[PDB]
Subunit: 355 residues, 2 copies
Amino acid sequence: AEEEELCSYSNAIELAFSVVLPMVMKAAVELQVLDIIAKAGPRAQLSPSQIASQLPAAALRCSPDAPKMLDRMLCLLASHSILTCSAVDFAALEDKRLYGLTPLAKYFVPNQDGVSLGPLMCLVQDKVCMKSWYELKGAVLEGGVPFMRVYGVESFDYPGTDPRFNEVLNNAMVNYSTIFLKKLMQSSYNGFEQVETLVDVGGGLGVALELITSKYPHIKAINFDLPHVIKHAKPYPGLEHVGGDMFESVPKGDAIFMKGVLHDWSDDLCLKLLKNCYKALPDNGKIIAVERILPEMPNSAGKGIFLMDLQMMTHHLGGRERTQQEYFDLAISAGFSGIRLECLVCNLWVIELYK
Amino acid sequence: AEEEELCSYSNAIELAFSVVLPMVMKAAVELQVLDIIAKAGPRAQLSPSQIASQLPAAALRCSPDAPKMLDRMLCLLASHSILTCSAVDFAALEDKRLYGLTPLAKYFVPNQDGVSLGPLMCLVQDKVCMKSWYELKGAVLEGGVPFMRVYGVESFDYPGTDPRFNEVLNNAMVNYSTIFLKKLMQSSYNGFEQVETLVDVGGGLGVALELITSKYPHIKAINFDLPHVIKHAKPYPGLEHVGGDMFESVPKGDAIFMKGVLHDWSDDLCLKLLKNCYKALPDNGKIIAVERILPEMPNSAGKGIFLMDLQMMTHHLGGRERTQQEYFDLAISAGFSGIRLECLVCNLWVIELYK
């Protein structure tokens, strides 16, 4: 156990300070450092001096050790394969190293459409969401929801009382929706080709149906949402916006689109929503649900699911993530014949529930 | 490029939610969950029901769905090799899996000496220390120190005005010092044998010199500290407690011991301290410095050094970490003949500076 006695200690030390890496990376997103490196052409290598000189420096005289701070941050970022670092065959310390973007880091720089996971980070580490984590110990021992134990009101009503958070929560969701939707539309899924009338549940501004009719103009589309949201709807030909409550009735259509709404509710309201869809659908039936499937047993290949599952229980404990068996049980409880997994797109699964 | 694209997207998604794992590990340590699993003998494999049935509940009865929350937390912890999970050979959901401790997790359970890295993790993620991370962008764009931009006073004076943080910091420092001291005193380093009188700089309560004279009774020990700290010292024969300022004078001795003092100060103050210590030593002597060496390049094998360097940067930015060349330059600036690296003990390097 000679190798264990030091490798395990090193891993424990690296785990003790685990919160430092997400704190620095967020800063490197807010400082627009990844953008400056990528604003000089492909295969770019910029020394810390150039990055510190092209920064949006409101103060003309940034302290002379700012290029040292940037170098110390970029060294940590490069140690985790987020950036590539190389030496200079040449002088100050800033002349020694050059940094460049990894394909991992290019997901945070805005893409051609202008969307990136960057704003999804700021939503996760914002103060309002972060203050919920300190009540987890109390929540486990005494029950309840971590968010309610801090702010009293349910998380579905808080954005109506906080201006600043209502912007971050709307930007992050839009960017994350667009990133997945662009690849979904470019994917090989052909389920939309046979759809005549499609109703989107919780479509917001209608971006999803916008893309749907963008590639398939023959599909007549209605965006179903709450009356509180429809007042922000952007008019667009073909699209029709319908306001109402999901749990009471759903507008009739030949197919139902829904993206990540089953994991925002409990195991009882989901049955009611599925039965409402069952009533709305005609004799022919089809539900196209984009979801995420928990593996039955822990494994190293599923980290990205679990890290987000624990995010949901400490923000709205009514909702939770489910495995394939639970989705099948809910579907057969609603009266549907069964479900089918079509394709994996951006770590999300497209599921067809057939009547 | 699909193989690269999917892997990069999955890794980016895993990186976006990177704070959830350190926020859940802290709650699982504070709840004393790792202790209950290891309080049933080696090769435990205890189900979530039993773990939820032995918690030191603050009320008569915990929430009925507490075992589900504990299971969901332990699944995430087992996905990262911190815990080992195994399916039961067949009932409730909590009956499905059994969890056991990995050698990585045994550093957080209080070992034979009653010390662990749990208090260090609690210190790192405390509110007072975590509020400094949100001013990093302002510090980079405008200079200064993140801690001073939040609390005004220097971090060396704050513990005198907050009783809770003063206790937390002391407990974490005691645990971390004790672990390293116990691991070092069992090692093969024999430099203490030739020392007649040894003076420890910043010895605190004297645990270091306590162990030194515990293994080597012939060594005469002097505990040098500030006058404000010496008052709490426990009387113990063989330890002469001397209060004073490190930057003014040092008591005479044949060897000077210091653990991580150098990285807490700027380059000028370090040179001043080394020059002051140069006067106390006789014509021949030793400086035994326990330090940590930054590699010249950001290799993937040294994360735990860069993480803690960034941690030290945004708390007392007047100090920083140094590489071997910088230590050598400081030593020859103080007038010492040279330095030697003796042994690597628990990711820390023992350095002997000879006159």
